[PDB]
Amino acid sequence: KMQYFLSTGNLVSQSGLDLQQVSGYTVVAEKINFYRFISHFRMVHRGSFFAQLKTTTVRKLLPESWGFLCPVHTPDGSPCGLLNHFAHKCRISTQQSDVSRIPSILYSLGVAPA
Amino acid sequence: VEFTPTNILSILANLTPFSDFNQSPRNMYQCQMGKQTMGTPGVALCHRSDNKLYRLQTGQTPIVKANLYDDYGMDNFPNGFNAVVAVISYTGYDMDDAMIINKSADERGFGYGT
Amino acid sequence: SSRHGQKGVCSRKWPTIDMPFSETGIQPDIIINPHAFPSRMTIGMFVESLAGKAGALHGIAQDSTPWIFNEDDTPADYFGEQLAKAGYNYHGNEPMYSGATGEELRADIYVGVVYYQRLRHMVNDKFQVRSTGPVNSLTMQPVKGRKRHGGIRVGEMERDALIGHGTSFLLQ
Amino acid sequence: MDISKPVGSEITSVDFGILTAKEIRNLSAKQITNPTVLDNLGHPVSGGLYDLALGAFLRNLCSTCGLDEKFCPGHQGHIELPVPCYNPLFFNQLYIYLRASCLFCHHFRLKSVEVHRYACKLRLLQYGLIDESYKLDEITDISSTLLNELKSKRSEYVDMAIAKALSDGRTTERGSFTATVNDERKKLVHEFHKKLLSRGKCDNCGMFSPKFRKDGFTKIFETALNEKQITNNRVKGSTYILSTEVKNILDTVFRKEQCVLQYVFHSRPNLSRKLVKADSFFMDVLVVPPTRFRLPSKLGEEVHENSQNQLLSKVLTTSLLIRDLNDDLSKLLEDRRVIFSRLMNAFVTIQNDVNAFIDSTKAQGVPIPGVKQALEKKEGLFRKHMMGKRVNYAARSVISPDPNIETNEIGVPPVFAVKLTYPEPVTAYNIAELRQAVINGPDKWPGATQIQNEDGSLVSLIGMSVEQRKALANQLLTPSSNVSTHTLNKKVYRHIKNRDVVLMNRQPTLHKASMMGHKVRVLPNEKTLRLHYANTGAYNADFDGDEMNMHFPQNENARAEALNLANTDSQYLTPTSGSPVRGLIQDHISAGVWLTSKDSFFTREQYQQYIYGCIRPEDGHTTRSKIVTLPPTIFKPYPLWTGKQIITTVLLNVTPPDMPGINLISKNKIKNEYWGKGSLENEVLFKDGALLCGILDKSQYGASKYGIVHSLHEVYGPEVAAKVLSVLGRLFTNYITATAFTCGMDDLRLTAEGNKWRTDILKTSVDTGREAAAEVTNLDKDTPADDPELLKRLQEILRDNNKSGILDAVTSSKVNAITSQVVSKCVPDGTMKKFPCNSMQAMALSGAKGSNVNVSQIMCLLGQQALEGRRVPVMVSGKTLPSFKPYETDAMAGGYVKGRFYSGIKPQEYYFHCMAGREGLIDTAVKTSRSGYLQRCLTKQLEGVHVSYDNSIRDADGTLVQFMYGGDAIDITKESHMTQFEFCLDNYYALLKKYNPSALIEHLDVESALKYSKKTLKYRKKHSKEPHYKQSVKYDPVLAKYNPAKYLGSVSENFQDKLESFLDKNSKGVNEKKFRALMQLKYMRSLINPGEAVGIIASQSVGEPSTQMTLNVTLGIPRLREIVMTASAAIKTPQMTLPIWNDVSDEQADTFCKSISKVLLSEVIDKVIVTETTGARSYVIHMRFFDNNEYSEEYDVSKEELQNVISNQFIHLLEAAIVKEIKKQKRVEANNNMNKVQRDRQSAIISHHRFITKYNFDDESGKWCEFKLELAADTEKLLMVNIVEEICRKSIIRQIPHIDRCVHPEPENGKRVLVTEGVNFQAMWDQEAFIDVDGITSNDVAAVLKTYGVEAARNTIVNEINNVFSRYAISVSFRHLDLIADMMTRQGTYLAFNRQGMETSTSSFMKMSYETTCQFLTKAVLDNEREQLDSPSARIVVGKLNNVGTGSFDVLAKVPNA
Amino acid sequence: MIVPVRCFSCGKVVGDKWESYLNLLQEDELDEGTALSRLGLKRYCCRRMILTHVDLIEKFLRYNPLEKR
DNA sequence: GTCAAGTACTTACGCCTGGTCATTACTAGTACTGCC
DNA sequence: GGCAGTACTAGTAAAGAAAGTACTTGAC
RNA sequence: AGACCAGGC
C-alpha cells in the first residue's frame, strides 16, 4: 500500500488528512539531465487545488519570499507562480530544537508567567 | 546584512551567466530550458535501465561560469559546448528564432548525442 | 539554446566554404540573428561573447555570478580591455568576409564564444505522417496518437476557419 | 470517399420523436434476458448482453444477417422492464403534468374554457399566424350556455384565420415556422405551464386534489390532504405512489384533454394525426445498443467489459429479482407482509438502474458514466467527434524557415512526399506521367503506392518488384472486361508532386488566415516543413519549435478551392481592418534601409548580379523573357548605379509591360533628422515605377497599409504583389550575403557626455518619492522623510486599498516624467555610435525588430516596474522588501529602477523586475481562457450568417439580420483604395486596364442608376439643415432601390459625397467625367460577393484582436464579457453623459452636480453614542453631527432637511430593524422648555412611531440629535450600535433614484461633459435648464433599450464595443460591429451570445452541439421539432454540403441531346 | 567524453594534445595560457578545445563489467 | 397575486508529445500434512 | 492405515477558497 | 479508452 502511493501519487485515507488535494503527491524523478534531476529536490508546490482555479493573486511573486523562494526559477504556462523552487542557501528544519530552557530564561528577562 | 546577494536565487538561477543583464522572462525561460537539455545524466549508464535517456557525447565546461558552478560539481555533468557564435544577418535562414550550424562543424561531431 | 533563453530550431547546416570567415581564419559554427536581441533584451548574451572570447585567448575562466560588476566598472570595459591586450577589438568585433562573394563586409562583425545547450526536442520525436491507418472502433475516425500511426485533429476552431474562407468542399 | 462511387439519395431533413414500446419489439433482433455477459471459454451466451443475434462478436458470425465482423452493421435488441419506469429525460416535464391535473375528473385544474384558449392560440402558432393569435383574446357564476358558445367563436375564428392565410399565399399546410414564432411559442407554453401549476381547486368540478412531492429522482410522493378541505370532497354529491399508478392517471388525463396537447407537443402541424400518449413519457422497454457499439475494453490480457454492459447487467439482475419476487404472489399473512415491502423496494432500484444507464448524475449511489454524459461537454460526442474530427491524409512536423520559395508554396520533406498520396483516375493524358509514376513504385519520388481498379479493388505496390510493377503499368489503361463497370477507369494513388495543393495550419487558428492553401515544392533533404517569411505574420509563427499541420485534399473540388478561394495570395489583406498581414520581416527590412540609402552605389558587375539573383527569367518571374536595365546614375569617372535604381528595375521586370509604372507618394518610419540636415528621405516617391526619393522600410514592404507592395496589390493585382515579395525576398537576401548586417556591444554605449546627462536627471529622482508622498498625504511644505506625521499617515494609506492606489498613481506619474527626460535627451543625441551605423537603434526606427521603449531600457533607463496598475506590493510592516526601511519615501523602494540592461540592475532592482516579468506571463498564459470563450460564443450564433444573392445578409434558416452588409455591401479587403482618390488619379491609365470600363458597358445598366443618384444628391443638399426627425425624406438612398452589383452608379451616400468633394477642391490627359466613371466601376467591383461567410468573419474580427489585449469604468475583455456574452442589465459600472448647455458656465455646473450626487445620513454624522440603561431597556441614541457651517457647505444639506430625514426616514427604518431582531431572538444641553413647538414636534414622534419616548433636535445649531428608545424586560440584549450604523448607511438625505454620484470631468475633445455614476433618464428630463436632453448618451445598453427603443440600444452597443478597442488602438471595421449589433437586437430585445440568447432558434443541432446537449435534446423531442438542416452545425452532424460560399448554389450540366 | 579529434571550427588536429597539456600543467608548472601557446594552438577556436575539455571518459571507465572488484 | 431569497445547474483557449497504473476482500473449497 | 487441522487457492462479490439564470418554496 | 504526472507552441 506504500508502493501504491509512490507509484501513483493517490492518497488513500479513511480519515482524510489536513490536505486539500487527494492526488498528485509523487512525481517521476527524470534524470533527463542533471539540471533537471537536482531541480526535483528543490521544488515547492502549493497544491493541485490551486492549479484548477481562475484567480491570479495566489501566483504572485511576493516580497516575503526574499531569499526563501527563487524569483525566476518558475515554469511558464499553467504551473506559473504555483510550482517554484527554493533559494540555494534556504534550508528546511527537520528536527524539534531544544526549547526546555527558554521559559526558564524568559522569566529572568521580565516576562510575568501565564 | 546578507553574506552575498546571490543566495536568493536558486541552483539553476545562479548558473545563468550575467543574469542581471537579461530581461526577466528570458531568465525565467533559461531555468525552464536548462533543465530540458541533452546533457550527461550520469556515468553509470551501463548499470541503468531507464526507459528513455538522452546523452550528449562530448560536453565542455563553460568559459563563462558562476562560482557556484564549480561548487555544486557541475563539471561532473557537462550540459553543452562552447560555440563560436557570430551575431550576423548573413544567411537569410535564421530570422525569427532560427539559427544555423556550420555544416563541417557537426561533420566533426559538434553537438552530437545519442 | 544559449544560457539566456535564446531558443530556436536549426534551418540548414550551412557549408564551410559558404560561411563568413574572419581574418584570423576561423569560421563561426553558430549564426544567431541580431534581431533576436532588441525585442528580447538579452544583453547577458552580448557580454558572454566578450567574456567568452577574452577567456579563450588568455586561457582563463571568468566568474559571472551576478552583481560582481557595478555601474562604474561595466563588463564591456572589463572584457574590452582584455580583448585589447590580446590584439583583438575592444568592442568584441572582428573583420569578416563573405564566403559566397569573397568581399569585405561593411562593418566589423560581432563574434565571440558562448556556451550553447542542445535541447531534447528533436524532429524525430515530433514529425508524424498519415495517409491512412488504424481507426477507432466506435466512430471509424482515425486514432489519437503519433506512436499508434494516428491522425491530427481538425477541431472546432479549424472548422469555422474553413467556413470563413467560404470553402465548402474543404470542410466536407 | 470515392468520386467514382456516387450516392443517390440525400437526407433533406430530420425530426425528433420518442420510441414507443411497440416499435422496439418489432425493430428488435432478440430480447436479451440474463445478466451474464459471456460464459467460460469466452463464448457469448445466448440471451445475454453479448449475443450473436445483436451482431458478430469476436470472430463469430452474426445470427441475424450471417456476416462477419467487418460487414455486420450491428443489430438492436431490447429488454422487458416489468414495471413502467420513468424516463429521466422527461421527468421534469412529466412532473408538471403529474401535478396540475385533477385526480377526480381527469382534466387539468384550470377551467376548461381557458385551457381551450391555449389550444386555439397554439394552433395558430403552428402556422405562420403570430399576429392573429393576439386578435383571439378580443373574442370575449357563469353558465355553460355561453361558454359552450364562446368556444365555438374562438374555434371558428381559427378555422377562418387558417383557411385565409393558406389561400393568401402565406402558409403551406406543412405550416410556417420561423425563429420569431419559436419565440412566442416558447413564451406561450411557459405561460401555460406556470398557470397550470398555480391552482387550488379544479375549476370544472370544484374540489381539491392531493398535492405531490418530488423527493428527487426515482421516487414520487403524494402529500396528506388536509382536514380543512376534505369537506369539499363531502359536499360534491407521505405515501409513495407506484409508477404504474402515475401512468394510470396520465393515460386518462391525456384522453380527456387530447385536443390541447396535440398543439403543445407539436411545433409544425401534425400531418400524421397521431395521438400523444402518456406512455411516451415513461419507458417500458430499454433498447440495448448493438454489440458493435459496446465492444469490451481490450488491452492485452486486461479485458474489461464496456461500461454500458456493467449498467445493463444491473438492470437485468434487478429484472430477474422482481420476477422472483412476483413468484411469491402466486404462492399466496407474514408471507405477504414482508414480500411486498421488498417488492416495492425493487420498484425503486430498477428505476435507479434505468436512471444510471441514461444519466449518471440522476442516480443515487466514481460512478459509471451514462448515455447522457457521452454527449455533453468537451470530450462528448458533438464537440469531440462531430464538430472536430481526426483526419486521414494529413501531416504535422516542425517548421524551419526557407527563402528561395515562391511565397505561395510550402516546402514538403521527402518523407511526407512518399506517404501522402492522391488518387488520379487514368485518362488519355495521364498515361505519359502516371505510367512512370506507377513504375517508380512506393519509394521513388515521383511515384505511386496503390492502384484502385475499376471494380473497387485495390492493389498495393509495396511488396512488389520492378518486373511485376512494369506489368501493371501496361495493364493500367485497358478497356473493361465487365459491363457493369464499363464507364469507370483505374485510379493510381500517385505521390504528392510539385503541382498539388496543401492546407497549412497553425494552432490556435484565431482567424481564417491562420489556415491557408499553399502550393507544394518538394525538397530533397530533411524532415521539416519549410515556410517563407511572408507567411509568418498571418500564422503568428516564429521558429522556436513551432510545428504546424498540413492537410492534403483528395479531390478536384477541394483542389480548386485551396488554389482559388482559400489561397494564400487571396489572403494578403485581412478582413478585420483591411490592413495587410503578409510581408517581409526582420533581415529584409534592415537590408532595404541600407540598400536604398544614398550611400549605396553599385558598379556594373554588382548591378547586374543583384538583378539576375532575384529575377531569374527561366522560372518566369520576368514579363519580357530578357532582363532590361537602366542607364547608370553617374556616368563619369566610372558608371555607378544607386541602390534606389536596383528596385526601380526590379519593379520594371516583374511588372507587366504596356501598362504604365506605379505612382505612389507615401512616407516611412525614419525621420529626416536621422539622416542629416535637409534630407528628404522620409517621403517616398515612385514616379512611373521609379523610386526617386526615400527609404523603403517596414511601412513600404511589410504588414503595413499604403506601402509600395500594398499599392502593387491594388494597381496590378494580387498575383503580382505576391511575386514582388518573392523577388524582394531574394534581392534582399543576396544583398545580405554579400553586404551583411550585424549588431554588437558597440551599439549599446552612450557617450561620455551622454552618461553625464543620464546620471544628472537621475539625481533629480532621489527626492521625487518624498515630494509625491507629501502631496498625497497633504503634509505642508518640504517635510522630511522621517517626519512622524508623515510616517503616521503613510501607515493609514497602506491599510486602505484605494488610498494606496492613489499613492501608487501620483508617484508613478512623477517618476515616468523623470524617465521621459532621460529618453528625450540621451537618445539619439547622447549615443556613441549613431544612425545608420548604430544597428540596435537602426532596427527599431525601421520597425524591423524592436521598439523605442526597448532601446530605452537597454541604453538609458529600465523604468518604473508596474504591477496590475499599481507599484510593487508592500508587506504588513510597510517594508516593500527587507532591504528597505519601513515606510520610506524613496522612488527606488517602490519599484522605480535606475539601472539599465547595459550596465546592470541592482539586486533589489532585479527582484522588483522579477515581479513584473511573472505578471506578464500569468496574464499571457492563464487569462486567454477568457478571450477564447468570447470567440466560441460569437462563432456559434454567427456561423450561418452569410451574404445572400439579394445582397442582403441573413441567417442560415432564412431570417434576416441586415438588409445590406454595412449599409453599402462592400468587402473590407477591397475598400482600401476606394477613397484614396489622389492615388487612383495618378494611376488612372493602369487601373483602367484592370477594371476596363468600355468592355463592361454591355452587360450592365448605366443610364438608370445615375439619374436617381442625381435626384437624391440634389435633394439632400437642398435639405439637411434641419435634424433627422424633421426630414420628410421623399427619396430612398440609391443603394436600396437599385442593385449595386448590377447598376453602375448605385453607390453609398458618403462615397458620393467624398467623390464630389475630391472632384471639386483640386481641379486638374484625363478629364473629370472619365475619373468619376472609373470610381463607380471600382466601387461596383469592390462589392461583396454573395456567399461570404460574414458572421464568421465578424466573429473572428473580434476574438482575434481580443488576443491583442492578452497573450472608473470597466475596460477590455471584462467589458466584452458584459456586452457580448452576458448582456447584463445589472452592469457593473453604469454611467450617463450629460451635455452642458453653452449658456451655463462651469461654476453653474459643479454647483449643480451636488444636487444630483447622493447624500447619505452616514455622510453627515461625526459619531453616535448610545447609552443603554437597564434597572425597562432604555437606549439613549445621541447622534453627533458635523458643524452646520461644515456640512451645509460640503453637501449643502440644510438644518431643517436633516431633521426630517431623522423624523420621517431614519426612524422608520431603525424601528423596522429592531422588531426584526426581537422576532428572531425567540429561538451640556439646556432644559426642554425652550418652546412648545419642540414639545409638539416631540409629541408627534412619540405618537406616530412605536417605542420612542423622547425626541429633540438641535434647532439652533444643528449639531446634535438625541432620542430615547425604550424596550421591555422580555427582550434580551441587542447590539444597537451595529444596528444604528447599518441604518445610517441606508437612510438617504437627498437621493435621485439609481444615481450615486455626478462628476464634472475635464472637457474631452471640445464638448462639455457631465458624467453621472448611475442611470436614470426620467429624472434628468426635468433638468432642461442645464443639460441638453437630446444628447444624453449612456453606458447601460439595457436602460437605453427601455427608454429610447430598439434602434438606440443598437447604436449604443456599437459605440460601447467600439471604445473597448479604442483604448488599445485596435481598428476593427464598423461592419463587424454592425452585424454583432444587429444579431443581438434581432428580436427587439437585447439577447446575449449564450444558451439563453440562442433558445429562440430553429436549428436544434446548433443548440445541442453548443452546450447543455440533453436539455436542448428534450426540448427538441417534446416539440417534435423538424429541422431543415440549415445551420452549418446541423449539416456537419448529418453530413451535408455546407450552405455557405461554394455550397450556396447548384451546378447544372447542359447535355446536348434530348 | 574523450578528447575531440579535429576541432569544430577550422579543423585543426587537436586530439593529440590532451595528454601533452596535462603534462605541461603538472610537471612543467605553467598556466593555461602559456600551455595552449606552446602546443601550437593559436586561434581561439582551437584554444577552447583543450582549455575546456572535461575528459569525462575517466569517470566512465571505473564501471568495468568485465573484471571483478 | 405577490416580491422574496434560497437553491440548483451551468459553463470556464486551441493543438501536440511522452510516461505510468489499473479490484479487493473473503469465502468456501480441495489438497497438504500431522497425527494416532 | 485413515482422520482432521491448517494453509493455501482460486473463486465469484463490493468499491476544503470561481460568476450567471431558472426554479420551487416562502411569508404576507 | 480513462485518471494522474511531466512537458511543447
Ligand SMILES: Nc1nc2c(ncn2[C@@H]2O[C@H](COP(=O)(O)CP(=O)(O)OP(=O)(O)O)[C@@H](O)[C@H]2O)c(=O)[nH]1
Ligand atoms: N492558444 C494558446 N497559445 C499559446 C499558449 N501558450 C503559448 N501560445 C503561443 O505560443 C507563443 C508564445 O510566445 P512567447 O511566450 O514566447 C512570447 P515572446 O516574447 O517569446 O515572443 P517573441 O518576442 O516574438 O519571441 C505565442 O505566439 C502563442 O500564440 C496557450 O496557452 N494557448
Ligand SMILES: [Mg+2]
Ligand atoms: Mg513559436
Ligand SMILES: [Zn+2]
Ligand atoms: Zn448482423
Ligand SMILES: [Zn+2]
Ligand atoms: Zn376536477
Ligand SMILES: [Zn+2]
Ligand atoms: Zn580551430
